């Protein structure tokens, strides 16, 4: 008995003990549950959030939320500077920039299907697990420019910019900040997909629900589409290292009253906040340029089977991280919110947003396991009031043998989530997603 209901699907912990602002948490009957029977551990990280200096109330966490370093997964924590705010390793997750991207063909299944394995195999070898690389300074620039520099590059279309969450580029990144551990073991990675839940897929839409916000994504069922689950690979991962040590060795000097250790922060304002915020940035603007070169060879893989550029017409419908801390615009201030496996999802009328789409919202993409449905939604206006702007990230909660079973071609080196975000009003539902073909880094 910790928790009221405001709202449906919406949860509130009132503030309690060390909490410094509510707690509130988005849910079903269902996943209600699922963390009732988890002794609610989640939640007690959620209410650990609620403990640090300069949060903004309330701190959040989206239905799929679970267990994490430190902040839960699926959580979403805005911090205000002016307040004496930090900024968490912890609260972004080893994986920064951890994302997705999803282009959109005008091919339909029937089209796609009679080369099927030729695609498979077309992708499985320009996409890396070939010849393509970067000198220390290009990848340097890269770490401070973003999916742009590939672009203008050739490695892309000129108007895929257009369509990255913040065009692929966060604005403070600083390689500098990035040390040479990270720096080294990323670098030779830019292009591939990675290892663990990584993965690459070609899909078609098999259900439209919102045929407006559809019209305006340009979706259309028996479209086929292509999605591309990776991040920053092993940089991201080593910068969270580098700076939550750094910012355990340097707490004492700050007085931050850290209940758990894996909350290790740091004031934004400090030295070494500002200097993770920089490098996290740097790994950020890496894993944009990851998806992108990806983008460029998985255009490459549809040519070299047959599909000619005007055929395929695979354009960036968006790409969005689902680990990462941005300063935003909330409460007519500047704030730094801190998202873990939970997306950005801005409504309708957005200068953020794609003029194409701003009537509609943010497109909000949520892959589901491999060889599961994926679903494309819309950010909504609740959303900015209740969510600082944001909405989920997953679906979910013999391994490729039953794939082949399916009907999916694998290449190896009813969402209840879905419904309790729709349901609390924080992401329309635009389409849904099946796999054919599945790459795996």
Same mark, same amino acid.
């Given at each position: 008995?910790? $928790?009221?209901?405001?709202?449906?699907?919406?949860?509130?912990?009132?503030?309690?003990?060390?909490?410094?602002?509510? *707690?509130?948490?988005?849910?079903?009957?269902?996943?209600?549950?699922?963390?009732?029977?988890?002794?609610?551990?989640?939640?007690?990280?959620?209410?650990?959030?609620?403990?640090?200096?300069? #949060?903004?109330?309330?701190?959040?966490?989206?239905?799929?939320?679970?267990?994490?370093?430190?902040?839960? /997964?699926?959580?979403?924590? *805005?911090?205000?500077?002016?307040?004496?705010?930090?900024?968490?390793?912890?609260?972004?997750?080893?994986?920064?920039n951890?994302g997705?991207?999803?282009?959109?063909?005008?091919?339909?299944?029937?089209?796609?299907?009679?080369?099927?394995?030729?695609?498979?195999?077309?992708?499985?070898?320009?996409?890396?697990?070939?010849?393509?690389?970067?000198?220390?300074?290009?990848?340097?620039?890269?770490?401070?420019?973003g999916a742009?520099?590939?672009?203008?590059?050739?490695?892309?279309?000129?108007?895929?910019?257009?369509?990255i969450?913040s065009?692929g580029r966060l604005?403070?990144?600083?390689?500098?900040?990035?040390?040479?551990?990270?720096?080294?073991?990323?670098?030779? %990675?830019?292009?591939?997909?990675?290892? &663990?839940?990584? $993965?690459?897929?070609? %899909?078609? @839409?098999?259900?439209?629900?919102?045929?407006?916000?559809? +019209?305006? $994504?340009?979706?259309?069922?028996?479209?086929?589409?292509?999605? /591309?689950?990776?991040?920053?690979?092993?940089?991201?991962?080593?910068?969270?290292?580098?700076?939550?040590?750094?910012?355990?060795?340097?707490?004492?000097?700050?007085?931050?009253?850290?209940?758990?250790? %894996?909350? *290790?922060?740091?004031? #934004?304002?400090?030295?070494?906040?500002?200097?993770?915020?920089?490098?996290?940035?740097?790994?950020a603007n890496f894993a944009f340029a990851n998806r992108q070169?990806?983008?460029?060879?998985?255009?490459?893989? $549809?040519?070299?089977?047959?599909?000619?550029?005007?055929?395929?017409?695979?354009?960036?419908?968006?790409d969005?991280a689902?680990?990462?801390?941005?300063?935003?615009?909330?409460?007519?201030?500047?704030? +730094?919110?801190?998202?873990? &496996?939970?997306?950005?999802?801005?409504?309708?009328?957005?200068?953020?947003?794609?003029?194409?789409?701003?009537?509609?919202?943010?497109?909000?993409?949520?892959?589901?396991?491999?060889?599961?449905?994926?679903?494309?939604?819309?950010?909504?206006?609740?959303?900015?009031? @209740?969510?600082?702007?944001?909405?989920?990230?997953?679906? &979910?909660?013999?391994?490729?043998?039953?794939?082949?079973?399916?009907?999916? +071609?694998?290449?190896?080196?009813?969402?209840?989530?879905?419904?309790?975000?729709?349901?609390?009003? #924080?992401?329309?539902?635009?389409?849904?997603?099946?796999?054919?073909?599945?790459?795996?880094?």
């Amino acid at each position: 008995m910790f $928790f009221e209901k405001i709202a449906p699907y919406t949860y509130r912990i009132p503030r309690q003990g060390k909490m410094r602002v509510d *707690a509130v948490f988005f849910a079903s009957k269902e996943i209600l549950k699922d963390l009732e029977a988890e002794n609610y551990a989640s939640l007690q990280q959620l209410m650990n959030v609620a403990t640090l200096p300069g #949060i903004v109330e309330p701190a959040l966490a989206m239905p799929d939320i679970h267990w994490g370093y430190g902040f839960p /997964i699926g959580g979403v924590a *805005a911090f205000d500077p002016e307040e004496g705010g930090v900024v968490s390793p912890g609260g972004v997750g080893f994986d920064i920039n951890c994302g997705v991207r999803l282009l959109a063909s005008h091919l339909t299944l029937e089209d796609l299907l009679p080369r099927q394995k030729e695609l498979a195999d077309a992708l499985y070898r320009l996409v890396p697990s070939r010849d393509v690389r970067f000198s220390k300074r290009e990848l340097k620039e890269i770490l401070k420019e973003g999916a742009g520099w590939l672009v203008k590059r050739g490695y892309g279309y000129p108007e895929d910019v257009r369509f990255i969450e913040s065009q692929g580029r966060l604005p403070w990144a600083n390689p500098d900040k990035v040390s040479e551990r990270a720096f080294e073991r990323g670098a030779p %990675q830019i292009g591939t997909l990675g290892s &663990g839940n990584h $993965f690459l897929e070609v %899909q078609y @839409v098999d259900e439209v629900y919102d045929e407006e916000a559809a +019209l305006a $994504f340009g979706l259309f069922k028996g479209q086929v589409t292509v999605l /591309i689950h990776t991040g920053s690979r092993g940089l991201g991962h080593q910068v969270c290292q580098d700076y939550v040590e750094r910012f355990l060795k340097v707490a004492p000097r700050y007085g931050i009253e850290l209940v758990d250790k %894996q909350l *290790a922060a740091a004031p #934004i304002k400090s030295p070494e906040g500002q200097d993770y915020l920089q490098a996290m940035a740097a790994a950020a603007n890496f894993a944009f340029a990851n998806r992108q070169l990806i983008a460029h060879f998985v255009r490459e893989a $549809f040519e070299k089977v047959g599909f000619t550029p005007r055929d395929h017409g695979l354009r960036v419908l968006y790409d969005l991280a689902h680990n990462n801390a941005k300063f935003e615009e909330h409460r007519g201030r500047r704030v +730094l919110v801190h998202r873990k &496996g939970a997306t950005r999802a801005f409504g309708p009328g957005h200068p953020e947003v794609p003029e194409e789409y701003r009537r509609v919202g943010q497109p909000v993409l949520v892959p589901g396991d491999m060889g599961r449905y994926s679903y494309v939604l819309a950010g909504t206006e609740k959303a900015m009031e @209740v969510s600082f702007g944001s909405s989920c990230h997953g679906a &979910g909660r013999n391994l490729v043998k039953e794939l082949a079973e399916r009907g999916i +071609l694998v290449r190896a080196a009813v969402s209840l989530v879905v419904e309790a975000v729709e349901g609390a009003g #924080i992401g329309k539902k635009v389409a849904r997603l099946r796999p054919l073909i599945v790459v795996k880094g």
